[PDB]
Design a protein around this nucleic acid. Sequence first.
DNA 1: TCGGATGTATATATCTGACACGTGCCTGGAGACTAGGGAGTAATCCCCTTGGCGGTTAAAACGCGGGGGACAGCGCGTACGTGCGTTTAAGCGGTGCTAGAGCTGTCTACGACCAATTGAGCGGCCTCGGCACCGGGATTCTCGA
DNA 2: CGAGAATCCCGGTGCCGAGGCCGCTCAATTGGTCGTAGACAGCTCTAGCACCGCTTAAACGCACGTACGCGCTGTCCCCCGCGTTTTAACCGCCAAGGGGATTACTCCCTAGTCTCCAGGCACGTGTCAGATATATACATCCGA
Lengths: 85, 82, 97, 98, 101, 146, 95, 96, 101, 76, 109, 109
Amino acid sequence: HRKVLRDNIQGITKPAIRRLARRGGVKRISGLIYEETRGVLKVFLENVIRDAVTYTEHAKRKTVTAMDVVYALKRQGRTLYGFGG
Amino acid sequence: VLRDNIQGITKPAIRRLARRGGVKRISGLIYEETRGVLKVFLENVIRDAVTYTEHAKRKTVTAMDVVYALKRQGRTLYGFGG
Amino acid sequence: PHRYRPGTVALREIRRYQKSTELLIRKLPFQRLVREIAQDFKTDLRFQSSAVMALQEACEAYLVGLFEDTNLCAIHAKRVTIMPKDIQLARRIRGER
Amino acid sequence: KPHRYRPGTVALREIRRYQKSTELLIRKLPFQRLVREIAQDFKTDLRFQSSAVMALQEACEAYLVGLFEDTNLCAIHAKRVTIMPKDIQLARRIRGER
Amino acid sequence: TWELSLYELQRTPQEAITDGLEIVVSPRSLHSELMCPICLDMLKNTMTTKECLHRFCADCLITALRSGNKECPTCRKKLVSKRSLRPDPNFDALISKIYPS
Amino acid sequence: ALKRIHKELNDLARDPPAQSSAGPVGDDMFHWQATIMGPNDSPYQGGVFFLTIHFPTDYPFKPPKVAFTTRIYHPNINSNGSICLDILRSQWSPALTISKVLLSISSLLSDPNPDDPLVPEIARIYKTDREKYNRIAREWTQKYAM
Amino acid sequence: RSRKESYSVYVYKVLKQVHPDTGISSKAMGIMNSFVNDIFERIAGEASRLAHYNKRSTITSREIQTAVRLLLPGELAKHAVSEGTKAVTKYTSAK
Amino acid sequence: KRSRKESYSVYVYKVLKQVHPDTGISSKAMGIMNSFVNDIFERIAGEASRLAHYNKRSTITSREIQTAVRLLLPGELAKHAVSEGTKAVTKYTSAK
Amino acid sequence: HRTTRIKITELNPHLMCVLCGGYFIDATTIIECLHSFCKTCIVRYLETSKYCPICDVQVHKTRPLLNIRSDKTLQDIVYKLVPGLFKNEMKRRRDFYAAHP
Amino acid sequence: MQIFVKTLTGKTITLEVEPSDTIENVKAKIQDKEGIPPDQQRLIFAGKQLEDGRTLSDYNIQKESTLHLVLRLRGG
Amino acid sequence: RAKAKTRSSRAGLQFPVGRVHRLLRKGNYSERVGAGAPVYLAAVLEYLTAEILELAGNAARDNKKTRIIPRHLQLAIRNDEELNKLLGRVTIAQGGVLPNIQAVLLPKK
Amino acid sequence: RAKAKTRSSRAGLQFPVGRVHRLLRKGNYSERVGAGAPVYLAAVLEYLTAEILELAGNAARDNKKTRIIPRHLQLAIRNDEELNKLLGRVTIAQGGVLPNIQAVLLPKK
DNA sequence: TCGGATGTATATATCTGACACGTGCCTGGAGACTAGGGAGTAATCCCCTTGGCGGTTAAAACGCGGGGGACAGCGCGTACGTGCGTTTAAGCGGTGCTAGAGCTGTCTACGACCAATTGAGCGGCCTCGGCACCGGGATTCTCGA
DNA sequence: CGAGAATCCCGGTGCCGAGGCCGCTCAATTGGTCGTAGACAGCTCTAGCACCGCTTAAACGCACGTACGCGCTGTCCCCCGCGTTTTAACCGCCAAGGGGATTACTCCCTAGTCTCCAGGCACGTGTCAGATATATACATCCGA
Ligand SMILES: [Zn+2]
Ligand SMILES: [Zn+2]
Ligand SMILES: [Zn+2]
Ligand SMILES: [Zn+2]
């Protein structure tokens, strides 16, 4: 009974990107970065959620479990430690 | 015992490898750097390729042992087997 | 009445978040990203609570991994500010773009 | 008074020359002496099939051409034309090798 | 968006014409539709783009992609290869019925 | 690269484009000539300028070479004759005809692109002055073209 | 002695459908043999993981659809799923 | 009926009490230590299976796990794990 | 040719819908299978299914409106080959707003 | 009214532009439909270009006419 | 008997369904292999070699040759965005490099 | 019988030789598994967890704590050059980042 | 703004060796059959995912000011490119030797498979101590002067 | 060289998650048999190594000059820091029900076996595609 979820990428706020940059050790951040790191999160998240949903489509589940994200990320060479497997 | 064969990768050979990379100008300190990079690359591939011959109890290094050592490092060759 | 120089509070925030291990991105507006992107692959997907938390800890760990590699592009271009030029080298040398 | 190209035109002529051809660019006998130096540290009196050294020429030269494509991008990003050993180290670190 | 307005929701189908009526077709009228814009000739073995829906010949797009940049040559959009194209056999029979042979 | 050229001559004889004309020099179907009638909003009244069109023999999949035989003072145009367009150099498609190229050259004479010149000292006084080149384009086109 | 199996017979049969006038040198048949051998191990490698993830001991065509959907990018996956199911539905009719 | 999920949690406490007998591990860092062990089965037994296919054999022996360790583990992790793996196998030629 | 006159009887089924059985008005095609229907046919029909009504190829996994794009060239074949639909569409439309401002 | 818009390579646009509107208002409607900025646009009627301050009523531009678009790429 | 036909002709294929089935058995992927599983692989492996030999055979006609050379295999692969995503960590022996000179290096006008 | 001892006590180990042997059987690696093969894995898997819990337990004493937290697992791993080579494509959940500020960003003297 | 110099594509003839086709043989795939268990299906439990309120307050958003840093311009100088002439050694091709790869055959020790047994390890339950949080005061950079 | 946020250090309260205990089933161990994988030994012969001589392609060294790297300067835009106001995350609570696990039963599908024969492999052979050499004509660079 969805309608549509509308935008939700603006919820990656500019102070949240400045916190992620300062674990990267960044002093100064130009204003054009925030529009592009939202577009790089799209490409991270679209690639993982493609694979994680095709692990649930064919286990014949309707919930995306925590292991289906772990196998979707291991398939891309980015393994998680601390969620099973 | 062979010695001093890294210098047989000459200066004009690195400039040919740079000009498939698309490089116009090359500073003079690069030829010592790229010889040190072939050392690290070949030492990693030959080390794995020899441990495939050591496991097979074999004294020649075959072409597949290079191909399996390269496939293991994420650099698969096409053309020499497999 | 009292101002720090620009760049000294920025160095404090580098030392705060390189000590902490908390999630820097929020949690409710990022279930909404996960559930928009998954709208294109199945309808009415449920999510385990630990499935969305595995996606935040993956997405934050690989954006922090970018910004470590876009410092190096900014510093080797002899800058301090990161430009969006620097994300584009880091994602091209890695093999992503 | 004799003929003399400006610096940069023969270099662009060689970029079009080698990006069109597919042969190997390192001489084949001084490359075998490397492979038989480096393998002495792992066994003694090893032999090599003739296609095992040629598999290492195809792999090494594809590795170095792939580096110089990335050290261009690190030199053009710093508003230069020369690649420098700064640029090799910066491309090799973002790849995850140093 | 694909939101229907008021007239779309309350419209009727316009029926066929089954009485025998000749169509005086003129070739000065159907230029921008049945002609390939690459070879400037009639469309044969038509391949339409997905994102743009523009019709070419099969041997004109595949030559235009490998001997040029990867765009639709009438939209500057993004094509990738020949598999981002679909053949339309329901368009090929328009030429074989209007213009045989 | 032979059959499509026959139908461009049908596209130029049935409906020839405005302020334009084109055609082959002779037996060679790869070396063409063309003329340009000057527009009236431009400082190029009393137009006629001749052209040479060369086909790369993989036409229409390589951009043709179109150059000037007459001298024109204009910031995106060499003293040798090569035209600085983004059409014929970078952004080209097989769906473009020469009759669409000539309308892109005719529109250069009214308003140029003053951000990427060929002789860069010419385009400097366009950006600051406007009364000079209104006379200069009317002096140097009544001599070498009229 | 000691006959060795490759995919060279079948790459010529796919040439003679696609381009019935061209051929392949021997150095590029050795590359086409290693396309096919190294995409078995991709597809059959991930089809075997899907059987272990779902605690099953058979690899069926359902687990090779999804290995194709995981591995092949974009529209390679759409055309290979559609032309892998057209072979299974043509196989099971002609038995 | 909960299926009795197996883990390596019992064996990571027994290696703590040899190494640091006065420290413990939180439950979130036990799930990380359970992920090290499971993802190094997959690496070592993955390459030990390939060494049997490459050499046309149907057994994975201790020879194929020595060389899988030598391929995977870098530098001095490989030397100390080969020696401490052969010290455990030679406690069978003396203890059967 | 020069004239190539034709009947409507051989040009019907390339101008006919299936969901209404009439001529195409605001024709949209599915990206995957390239079967065309009216805008007031597919937008109603893909509220219920995810499949083409001709060949049952799945339009999209979740929302089938993404793989629908309107084909301008197939309309312009319908208005030109059929005598007087561009008027008769507007005359039906202008008479609608004459009662519904 | 419905005025067709030709390009150099063959994009066709249906614009609903009244003849009372200025030529700059025609440029601003191609903003909202295809993203093209007006500062790159050229517009040609049979040899004569369009000035900015005029309208579409000066050239007797009737129903179902054709435009032309030439892109002024500022920098090349 | 009844004149043994093949499995790959029953599938309408040319890649061998019989070899694929025993390379899935011998090769330690699962305990069992379904009957429609080698039919699915042999169809996917045809129409990935067919999609390369289309593009490689077209690149051989541009160089006016009637044999596919490993130059034409990289001109086929590195000009698709989708055959680059399969084969991005793959070097083709004697395949060379796509000609790409960057615009900063070209001489000024 | 003779009072079943274990295999992992005969090897002088604590990681289970009995589980490793049936995860090598069930798991489709080879047809057969040798008898000294799970003894070799269970010894390698001890002395890679022992070498992490040494270094993680030392990082817990520097923060004056008596429990290993996943902060201390990344301080153990990302400070070795050899545990970074195993675990370079591995993110540890809630592990954080090593504190490294580069010298260009620090204020001038 | 141009003609000489150099490099390029283009055409033609000759020649060789690698591709493509053919043949004979054998071993791997197909046909036919049987048996057993993997998976599909139905029913049922109960966990955990969604959904919705309401109060709180951390965190985002906005706006303003000013200083630091990006960026362009400019001048100096040295290091890299081009090129000629001389030196080196790669490449070829030829001959000769033998190590070692690859195969065959015989035979035994090793591992699967089985049945019975029993204790290690899982899940549930309980509790106390490590660690988080609060709060007060030491105290350490930071910055104006 | 003092003022003022900010960072550490310390002593105290309080709770919840780690660590231990226990009942118990299921998985590992013991003991035994059996067929085959692999170890071993002998032998064939391919191919890897070593040497030689000659031709000449390519590396090396040197000189000269241009143009690019780099330091310096100045101007200005645009980030940072901060204070104020506004948004909605977060927390706790409650409630409903989809769907994930789990069981039990049954039957279709896959392994296994035996036999039969044809597809594919090795080996051989002849012709043509491609490589090389020559001789053009034309394109392109650059000092005057
Ligand atoms: Zn288009
Ligand atoms: Zn065409
Ligand atoms: Zn309709
Ligand atoms: Zn359809």
